[PDB]
Design an enzyme around this catalytic site. Structure first.
Site: not given
Ligand SMILES: O=C1C[C@H](NC(=O)[C@@H]2CCOc3ccc(Cl)cc32)CCN1
Ligand SMILES: O=C1C[C@H](NC(=O)[C@@H]2CCOc3ccc(Cl)cc32)CCN1
Ligand SMILES: [Cl-]
Ligand SMILES: [Cl-]
Lengths: 305, 301
Positions: A41, A143, A145
């Site tokens: 992603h 940040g 990920c």
């Molecule tokens: O553990 C975390 C990570 C999180 N970021 C996501 O979840 C992204 C952005 C949102 O929408 C999504 C949707 C899908 C996926 Cl794979 C990623 C994401 C931000 C807060 N903390």
């Protein structure tokens, strides 16, 4: 003495963390040999995340669209490919700090250490468990990920998790290092919810053995139970079924403390039915389920890496 | 989102851990530049444990009485000196993995990461707080002496603790990296007991702010309290006094959540009175006191 939630020493993994940038997005990558692994992603804009066609988004990218930074040095990307939900960026330099490693997919109940990273820089290490609902109760901000989960067995790092997303309840979802999600999750901004979770029974029993080893015995009783009667109680209290494999795995701790596994099950049954009555076990008023039998043996014996 | 007990990444400290042997005793040392720091009790025999005269025991040792092993390489000890309760072994090689570091003596309530080691090899990392009674509730077995506590805010490791001993209650005592013990403890096996421990109030309030930041508010109430009335109640539950310094320190978290410090104090008073009534706060059924205000801001922001 003492019993703490303990993570593996993170140094071997810290030497692999890099920053991956694609357009406006920056996240973490894992640099092993000449490949940098990161969530696929990273190539998505916010609108693309609504319904991404990763093959279509990736075919439009050139190697120079991926900026990889290892410390203060830029790593040149010379190839890219996707494996499930992980992007693999071929770089022109093998990581000289690549430890002995393997990629392993873990099962629910198994624990691992997470090295939380931001901008390719490790910020913290914590221990967690793969919940029975395939989420992890992590601590991650924007940040994070691409941060990874791992175990160490001797001098070999077994990478088991890469962070991808946070679900609405504040719990986290990710993949193994082959890009296969743990749980029924997809890498898309769409309505997704963690299923009802359960307690990891074998881990609670392991932690009760750790409590006995540390001098906490108040919960012991004269009783024993059958595996079938215990599982009837476990099902009633949203605890995972205890299998004969779990009983066998707890054998060493049962022999060390003199408390048979089914004897400890009778302590657990009573705790579930009666509560703790104002008491604590290892400084906790809840039954802890994020220590496996191997974690308890390792901590109560002093295994090094 | 999420709130975990989080340790600093331990790599910078792992590259400093060595094994120190003196006679029959083996423990851990911290190798920084050309010096290996370790507990001075490494020079003690079975007859020296109660009333060791460390100056007298040390003057009898030569450099070759100290064997220092870094990985599979023996370092050559070329000098030795004692600074308070720490032995400093000068070695012939500077540690190439020496990170940017400093030695800091911490105050009760402060948190730090511990890299538990055996035979110079790191085995695990966990988070600790220096208790109000100057002990730490660590997880240490025989051979763990010389394991260190540290913080890593930025790229600089601040070493704050070196492990020396376990008290009869299973809690731990040690020194800063200048060899000064935390608490009224001595490196003697004479009868020593930790004083009655208390809860780190400022840390519990910080963790209640962390819970509010993470979406939990069930424990909030419409009340406030004076600082003095709060202290009168909290001391009855063996909580540390909350000072005006602590109130000032919680200012940023108060401004972020919109909950005045004395308003949060009233929530804490109520929690002490009522318990949690089957509820949890950040996955805990007890009030957590090993997150400082600084830890909460770092983890949430
Ligand atoms: O553990 C975390 C990570 C999180 N970021 C996501 O979840 C992204 C952005 C949102 O929408 C999504 C949707 C899908 C996926 Cl794979 C990623 C994401 C931000 C807060 N903390
Ligand atoms: O890790 C351990 C712990 C414990 N070691 C001590 O008791 C040392 C022995 C020398 O004499 C002394 C003298 C003082 C002190 Cl603080 C410690 C000691 C037993 C062996 N293993
Ligand atoms: Cl085992
Ligand atoms: Cl401090």
């Amino acid at each position: 003495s003492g019993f703490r939630k303990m993570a593996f020493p993170s140094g071997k993994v810290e030497g692999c963390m890099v920053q991956v940038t694609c357009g406006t997005t920056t996240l973490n990558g894992l640099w092993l040999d000449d490949v940098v692994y990161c969530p696929r992603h990273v190539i998505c804009t916010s609108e693309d995340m609504l319904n991404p066609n990763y093959e279509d988004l990736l075919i439009r990218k050139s190697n120079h669209n991926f900026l990889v930074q290892a410390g203060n040095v830029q790593l040149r990307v010379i190839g890219h490919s996707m494996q499930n939900c992980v992007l693999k960026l071929k770089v022109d330099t093998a990581n000289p700090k690549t430890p002995k490693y393997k990629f392993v997919r873990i099962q629910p109940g198994q624990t691992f250490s997470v090295l939380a990273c931001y901008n390719g820089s490790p910020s913290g290490v914590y221990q967690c468990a793969m919940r029975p609902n395939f989420t992890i109760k992590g601590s991650f901000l924007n940040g994070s990920c691409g941060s990874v989960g791992f175990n160490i067995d001797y001098d070999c790092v077994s990478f088991c998790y890469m962070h991808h997303m946070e679900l609405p309840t504040g719990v986290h979802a990710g993949t193994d290092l082959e890009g296969n999600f743990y749980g029924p999750f997809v890498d898309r901004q769409t309505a997704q919810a963690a299923g009802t979770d359960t307690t990891i029974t074998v881990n609670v029993l392991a932690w009760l053995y750790a409590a006995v080893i540390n001098g906490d015995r108040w919960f012991l009783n004269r009783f024993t139970t059958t595996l079938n009667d215990f599982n009837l109680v476990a099902m009633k209290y949203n605890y995972e079924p205890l299998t004969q494999d779990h009983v066998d795995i707890l054998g060493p701790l049962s022999a060390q403390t003199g408390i048979a596994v089914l004897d400890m099950c009778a302590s657990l049954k009573e705790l579930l039915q009666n509560g703790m009555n104002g008491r604590t076990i290892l400084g906790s008023a809840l039954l802890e389920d994020e220590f496996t039998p191997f974690d308890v043996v390792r901590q109560c014996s002093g295994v090094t890496f």
